[PDB]
């Protein structure tokens, strides 16, 4: 996945820019990790970005 | 390559006043000339830069 279930981080779109500068469309995906979470009392998977995982916005 | 461009700078005000050509094989060492230095405003010894 490339969308964070927390903070809704989503891919950006930009350019491959070679030495000749012949720009080509490309994507920057967020570092989405699928981890086990225990929310309230629910065990389930969630696709969580590493930024949220580092900030602790996700309960494991 | 065999007759490179050499730059004569005054030995007083170290100013690259002139540029010319030598032979490298006929004149391997740096060349000494008395040329007019505009800054020094007279004739000063000019030496090829290293």
């Amino acid at each position: 996945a490339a969308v964070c279930d927390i903070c809704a981080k989503r891919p950006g779109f930009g350019h491959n820019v070679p030495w000749s500068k012949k720009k080509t469309n490309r994507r920057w995906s967020p570092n989405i990790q699928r981890v086990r979470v225990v929310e309230n009392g629910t065990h389930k998977r969630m696709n969580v970005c590493t930024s949220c995982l580092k900030a602790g916005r996700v309960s494991r | 390559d065999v007759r490179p461009k050499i730059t004569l700078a005054c030995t007083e005000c170290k100013e690259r006043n002139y540029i010319t050509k030598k032979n490298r094989r006929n004149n391997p060492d740096r060349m000494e000339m008395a040329k007019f230095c505009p800054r020094c405003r007279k004739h000063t010894a000019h030496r090829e830069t290293r």
């Binding site: - | 461009k5 540029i19 010319t20 050509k21």
Partner: protein, 67 residues
């Protein structure tokens, strides 16, 4: 819409008080060692364009007064 002036013409040509068009002499940017001081003196000045070239430059400048 307003007419844009030619960028190279702006950067390269001047217009005098009396409407003359002048440019800088060409051929003195490099390779100056073999050139005599007389040649460099001939190339170091400011040249006045011919009538046709001056008219073309004035058309290229969209009323720009030159550099």
């Amino acid at each position: 819409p307003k007419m844009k002036s030619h960028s190279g013409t702006k950067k390269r040509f001047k217009v005098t008080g009396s409407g003359k068009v002048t440019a800088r002499k060409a051929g003195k940017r490099h390779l100056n060692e073999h050139k005599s001081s007389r040649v460099t003196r001939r190339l170091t000045g400011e040249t006045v364009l011919s009538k046709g070239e001056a008219a073309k430059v004035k058309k290229l400048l969209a009323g720009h007064p030159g550099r």
